[PDB]
């Protein structure tokens, strides 16, 4: 098997077979198969559940606040204050359109925090593939 | 097993190449599986697949794509989510799809298709990504 730190990313089926006892961070290339939830602002923060896949598994995830804020361009506080002015709320709505699109089109390296007792992970950060990633994959296949 | 209103294929979308489908796939519609008798391992399940390719042809919700290994065909694209629009010849995209036919030309029923043309590296990695992954399934 593969250590869970091997660049440029690992596989969710490998992580599962590891049988981790504790909460474990890995990185994987996934896309969203589907949402399982509407955008929420409960708790004063953004949340959304999804099923992703990296080709080896399916996995329930929630996006962290910081991701969804950067996709929309608005925090929960900013969104509420946007509701008090028509022009600013419009910019929020375009933010929302953009985000919903981003999610449809998302295909990248997700840094996921996986809780083994709960079958549920948290997506901490996203990153697009680059030349370095490519080399790493080259090297790891000895090619 | 989720929200009502989300029902997904049983096993995940395995990354593949047209050629592999064309040659190593076995069974028939609804019962597909990939042969790994070459590396002496067991059959893998082909409900869904993850392919990538350049668009050659686009006709409504049909399309013919091509990866380094060859041509593959897609239908029902009129029913999947529409992100950045990418049913244009020359775009590089990814499909998630359910295998309809394998040979002589692989046909998928699309569940998703997504643009990947705003970053060349996707194309460079596709063939290695496929191989790396097949190597990490026991």
């Amino acid at each position: 098997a593969m250590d869970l730190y091997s660049p440029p990313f690992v596989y969710l089926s490998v992580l599962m077979a590891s049988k981790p006892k504790e909460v474990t961070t890995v990185k994987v290339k996934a896309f969203i198969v589907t949402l399982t939830g509407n955008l929420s602002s409960s708790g004063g923060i953004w949340s959304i559940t999804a099923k992703v896949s990296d080709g080896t598994a399916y996995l329930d995830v929630d996006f962290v606040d910081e991701i969804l804020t950067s996709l929309i361009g608005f925090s929960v506080p900013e969104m509420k204050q946007s509701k008090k002015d028509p022009l600013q709320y419009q910019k929020f709505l375009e933010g929302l359109q953009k985000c919903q699109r981003d999610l449809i089109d998302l295909c990248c390296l997700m840094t996921i925090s996986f809780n083994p007792s709960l079958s549920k992970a948290m997506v901490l950060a996203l990153q697009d593939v680059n030349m370095e990633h490519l080399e790493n994959l080259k090297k790891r296949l000895n090619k | 097993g989720g929200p009502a209103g989300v029902r997904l294929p049983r096993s995940p979308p395995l990354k593949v190449l047209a050629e592999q489908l064309r040659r190593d796939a076995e069974g028939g519609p609804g019962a597909w599986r990939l042969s790994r008798a070459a590396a002496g391992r067991g059959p893998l399940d082909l409900a869904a697949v993850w392919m990538q390719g350049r668009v050659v042809m686009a006709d409504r919700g049909e399309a013919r794509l091509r990866d380094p290994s060859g041509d593959f065909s897609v239908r029902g694209l009129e029913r999947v989510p529409r992100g950045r629009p990418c049913l244009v010849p020359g775009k590089y995209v990814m499909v998630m799809g359910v295998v309809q036919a394998c040979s002589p030309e692989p046909c998928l029923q699309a569940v998703k298709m997504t643009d990947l043309s705003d970053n060349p590296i996707h194309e460079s990695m596709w063939e290695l990504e496929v191989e790396d992954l097949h190597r990490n399934i026991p």
């Binding site: 198969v33 | 029902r7 997904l8 029913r79 999947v80 359910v98 569940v111 998703k112």
Partner: peptide, 13 residues
Amino acid sequence: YSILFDKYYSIPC
């Protein structure tokens, strides 16, 4: 098959 993004999308299965 069904998935949800901005809305539900349904796929012949």
